[PDB]
Amino acid sequence: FTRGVYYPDKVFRSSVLHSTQDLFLPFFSNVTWFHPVLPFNDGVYFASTRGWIFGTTQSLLIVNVVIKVTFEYVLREFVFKNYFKIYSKHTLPQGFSALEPLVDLITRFQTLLAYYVGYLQPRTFLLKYNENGTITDAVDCALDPLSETKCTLKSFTVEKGIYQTSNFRVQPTESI
Amino acid sequence: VTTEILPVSMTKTSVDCTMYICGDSTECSNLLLQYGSFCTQLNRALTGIAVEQDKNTQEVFAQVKQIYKTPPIKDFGGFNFSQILPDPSKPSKRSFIEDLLFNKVTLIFNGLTVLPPLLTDEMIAQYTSALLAGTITSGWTFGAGAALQIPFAMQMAYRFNGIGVTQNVLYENQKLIANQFNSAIGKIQDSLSSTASALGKLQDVVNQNAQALNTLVKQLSSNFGAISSVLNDILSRLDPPEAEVQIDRLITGRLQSLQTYVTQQLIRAAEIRASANLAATKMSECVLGQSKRVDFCGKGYHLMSFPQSAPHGVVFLHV
Amino acid sequence: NQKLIANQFNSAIGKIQDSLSSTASALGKLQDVVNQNAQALNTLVKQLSSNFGAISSVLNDILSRLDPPEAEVQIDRLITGRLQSLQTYVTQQLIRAAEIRASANLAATKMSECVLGQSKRVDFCGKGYHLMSFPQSAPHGVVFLHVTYVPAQEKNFTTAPAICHDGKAHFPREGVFVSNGTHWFVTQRNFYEPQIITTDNTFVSGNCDVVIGIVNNTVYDPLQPE
Amino acid sequence: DAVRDPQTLEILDITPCSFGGVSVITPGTNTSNQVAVLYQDVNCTEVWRVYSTGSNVFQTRAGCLIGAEHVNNSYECDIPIGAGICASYQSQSIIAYTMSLGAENSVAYSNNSIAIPTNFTIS
Ligand SMILES: *[C@@H]1O[C@H](CO)[C@@H](O[C@@H]2O[C@H](CO)[C@@H](O)[C@H](O)[C@H]2NC(C)=O)[C@H](O)[C@H]1NC(C)=O
Ligand SMILES: *[C@@H]1O[C@H](CO)[C@@H](O[C@@H]2O[C@H](CO)[C@@H](O)[C@H](O)[C@H]2NC(C)=O)[C@H](O)[C@H]1NC(C)=O
Ligand SMILES: *[C@@H]1O[C@H](CO)[C@@H](O[C@@H]2O[C@H](CO)[C@@H](O)[C@H](O)[C@H]2NC(C)=O)[C@H](O)[C@H]1NC(C)=O
Ligand SMILES: *[C@@H]1O[C@H](CO)[C@@H](O[C@@H]2O[C@H](CO)[C@@H](O)[C@H](O)[C@H]2NC(C)=O)[C@H](O)[C@H]1NC(C)=O
Ligand SMILES: *[C@@H]1O[C@H](CO)[C@@H](O[C@@H]2O[C@H](CO)[C@@H](O)[C@H](O)[C@H]2NC(C)=O)[C@H](O)[C@H]1NC(C)=O
Ligand SMILES: *[C@@H]1O[C@H](CO)[C@@H](O)[C@H](O)[C@H]1NC(C)=O
Ligand SMILES: *[C@@H]1O[C@H](CO)[C@@H](O)[C@H](O)[C@H]1NC(C)=O
Ligand SMILES: *[C@@H]1O[C@H](CO)[C@@H](O)[C@H](O)[C@H]1NC(C)=O
Ligand SMILES: *[C@@H]1O[C@H](CO)[C@@H](O)[C@H](O)[C@H]1NC(C)=O
């Protein structure tokens, strides 16, 4: 429903409404339920109910804490974006929380010994920071006309009226 | 009977800023992102102008809450109002003088669009016909509460009583007053039906709004020191890191042209506000009552006035 | 009717008090000015984070990373981009100030003509027949409380322009000739108050074969015993 | 706007694509969450797919309105659209209608009738 919102940068901000064009998982998108062969388009949201096996056929490995890559280091949500970055937070219900970053640094992946697989898309959100600098809300602009109106006025409440938001144009179908 | 012409509103134009600067080019719309919020400023200014133009027409014409009707027995003591009252043979509320006035003014995409008004010409004609019917059947009483009926000869008698002349002058010269009023309305009808062009104050607004749009279209064929005025030719002849410095010059020139246009549209709308406020005050003090101000409603001792609609304007007929 | 007029005035003041003490948002014309000024200042502040073609929007990390031979080329773009935004802001403030000045001149004219005297201009000091007005202060504005006369509860009658009594027409000094079906009276024009038609509230002019609509009646003579 | 075919020598014309605009008619968020979408002057046949086809399609002189049930009544105007058409939110939905200019009244004029007020109201 509303999953896959992290802190897009390392700069502290508070009580603002910042607009970030970043690769996100779109709201109300369909994800596969497992209880195998999993491709890699641009980035994968992961959840669970041990570790991971990445690569193409080098191999990127996480077991459980030791990591083989060469590099080595000694209800759970995981954003695996690759610029390989791991975001993680644990406490699919209707809830929503911001995923704090953990660590920093492929055409398929796998897992060790139920989970979920999402796929990130080029989007543009509108984050709501708070007094403590954490994220409490977000708005996907290209979901519906109401959220596009919220992205235009840059608020989360809209007054009664009529608002010009964008324009449309049929794309060129084929080349000649 | 004299004629007084005032502008009320003008054409509601809108501009697609991104398309006018560089349409169908994402690597130019990404270069327009390096300038902050300019197109939102320009769209906010033009949207405020567009709402302002509907507010002008609303406050000039919508000054009644009823819609009055003229009675089917038109025996008004000898006066003849058929040239200004509505005519049902035509498919509108519009009348004969209003047909002449609508036929006199005859002038009438890179983002440049024109928005329609809120009130239509038929609705504005219904407002003016309600104003005429309320005036003729009730005097000034319908502008201060409930419309109270009175015979038209008695109304005209104590409109004479408000310029220092007694009412026996009217009750002993009623037929002469009626014939002079009918001949004056006929002379107005003849001087409007002839080829004398008296709607120059309304034609000036249309010509001044057309020249600015034609200049704004004409500025798209200037190179501004670049190699071409066509963006696709630059994008097909150059690599991107050499096309950057040409697209920047085109963006700078087209932003300068848009800002000049928007500033002059703001300054031109500022006087249309003043003319619409003058027209609203003249409506309230000439049509809804009788005015003691010298040379405000006509030229002479004022008796009564009638409103008529016009393209982006209003015409008062002061008696 | 002094007590009735007093109670109606008190009830009207109480209803104004109630419609302000509720949550009815009425000061929108005053809130618009504050909103537009705050929005213009917020846009002028947010224009400082644009780089206008340069490598950054901060002047300090340009000066601490480049030498003055090819640093001024970066600084000139920011100087032009900020001059343009200042010029736009000042131009639109100059355009707003003339509208505020026209509204202030209208408020001064209303203060002179509605409060310091009684006005005959229709719908200038309220809707109806104006009596008096009161000022009240507001944040960056003024609020006028116009007190007007509104007629109510009308009634149909039969009228006539003149009266022929002894072969002479009779016209009213002020008011209209009305009739309730059987008798004829003269009353004032804005309040029904019928009186007997005598030779002290009428005047005579000519004979009664010219006026279109004249009606026979008796015009009383007040010096009856002498 | 015109060009010659370089192989068949044919005179074939050029016109641009659709190019409209999009407005969003909505109540407050403290009342509902449904919207309506106005497409600027496209005549409803060349037009998100729920807001492209389906029921609740209405043709205006200002454009193509999708998501609002047109009725035959006439109310005080609530949200202006253009050319006489207004919109309002009324088991609850968004409607579109032709706005009314006021009530109906006919003054009972004759040549010998007058109306005199008998009371008053201080306002
Ligand atoms: C008011 O004036 C009009 C003229 O504008 C009169 O209309 C004429 O009506 C007669 C028949 O009654 C026609 O034969 C004429 O052709 C009409 N004139 C024109 C110019 O078309 C009208 O009769 C007048 N009203 C009254 C009550 O006499
Ligand atoms: C019109 O007004 C006159 C005012 O005099 C009314 O005449 C009086 O009516 C009362 C009835 O209450 C009688 O007691 C008086 O004797 C009448 N006076 C005269 C001089 O006739 C008259 O009734 C009214 N007519 C209508 C139809 O209301
Ligand atoms: C108003 O009164 C006058 C005077 O009584 C009437 O005039 C005369 O009335 C007598 C009798 O009715 C007639 O024989 C005369 O021919 C009338 N003279 C004129 C010059 O008309 C008059 O008729 C009355 N009017 C009404 C409407 O009753
Ligand atoms: C004054 O008289 C007129 C004329 O009769 C009244 O208007 C009538 O109102 C009724 C409504 O009950 C209609 O059926 C009639 O058709 C109306 N007559 C005309 C000629 O239009 C009017 O209501 C009366 N007003 C007062 C205050 O008594
Ligand atoms: C004029 O209208 C006023 C209403 O504003 C009437 O005053 C009311 O009269 C009734 C009589 O039954 C009293 O019960 C109310 O208390 C009065 N209201 C106030 C505010 O005092 C007045 O009677 C009317 N006058 C006439 C002649 O009809
Ligand atoms: C911020 O944290 C404090 C305690 O750490 C808490 O009392 C407060 O409610 C928090 N505010 C928000 C907006 O979460
Ligand atoms: C008023 O009109 C009627 C016809 O309805 C007519 O008989 C009467 O003579 C007219 N009155 C005047 C004073 O013209
Ligand atoms: C618009 O559509 C209607 C019917 O859908 C049609 O009658 C009319 O001709 C069309 N107008 C244009 C300009 O295509
Ligand atoms: C509105 O009126 C038209 C008649 O012109 C009718 O065909 C249509 O069904 C009516 N629609 C509604 C919702 O009443």
Numbering used by the authors:
A (entry chain A): 32 to 66, 82 to 95, 102 to 109, 115 to 121, 126 to 130, 167 to 171, 189 to 196, 200 to 208, ...
B (entry chain B): 722 to 829, 855 to 1065
C (entry chain A): 919 to 1144
D (entry chain A): 574 to 620, 633 to 675, 689 to 721
Sentences from the paper on this structure:
A major focus of SARS-CoV-2 research involves the trimeric spike glycoprotein, a type-1 fusion machine responsible for receptor engagement and viral entry into target cells. As is the general case for type-1 fusion proteins, the mature spike is embedded in the viral membrane in a metastable prefusion conformation, which undergoes large structural rearrangements as it transitions to its postfusion form, a transition that facilitates merging of viral and target cell membranes and virus entry into the cell. Two proline mutations, originally developed for the MERS coronavirus spike, have been shown to stabilize the soluble trimeric ectodomain in its prefusion conformation. When combined with the T4-bacteriophage foldon trimerization domain and a mutated furin site to prevent cleavage, the “S2P” construct has become the de facto protein format for research into the biological function of the SARS-CoV-2 spike.
We found that transferring 8-day aged S2P protein into a buffer of pH 5.5 for 10 min restored its DSC-melting profile to a shape nearly identical to that of the fresh protein and restored a fully folded conformation of compact trimeric particles as revealed by NS-EM. To determine if the impact of low-pH-induced refolding could be maintained upon returning the protein to neutral pH, the 8-day aged protein that was subjected to the 10-min low-pH treatment was transferred back into PBS using buffer exchange and then reassessed by DSC and NS-EM. Such pH-treated protein exhibited essentially identical melting temperature to that of the freshly purified protein and retained its folded, trimeric conformation. Furthermore, subsequent storage at 4 °C in PBS resulted in gradual unfolding similar to that observed in protein samples not subjected to low-pH treatment, indicating that transient exposure to low pH “resets” the S2P spike to its original state. To determine if prolonged storage and transient exposure to mild acidic conditions are associated with structural changes in the folded spike, we used cryo-electron microscopy (cryo-EM) and single particle analysis to solve structures of the spike immediately after purification (0 day), following storage at neutral pH and 4 °C for about 30 days (∼30 days), and after a brief incubation of 12-day aged spike at pH 5.5 followed by returning it to neutral pH (12 days, pH 5.5–7.4). We noticed that the number of intact spike molecules per micrograph was substantially reduced for the aged protein versus the fresh protein (average particles picked per micrograph using crYOLO software: 63 versus 243), and refolding via a transient exposure to pH 5.5 increased the average number of particles per micrograph to 174. The final cryo-EM datasets for fresh, aged, and refolded spike contained 403,167, 95,641, and 252,067 particles, respectively, and the corresponding maps were refined to resolutions of 2.6 Å, 3.5 Å, and 3.2 Å. Overall, the structures of the three spike proteins were very similar (r.m.s.d. < 1 Å).
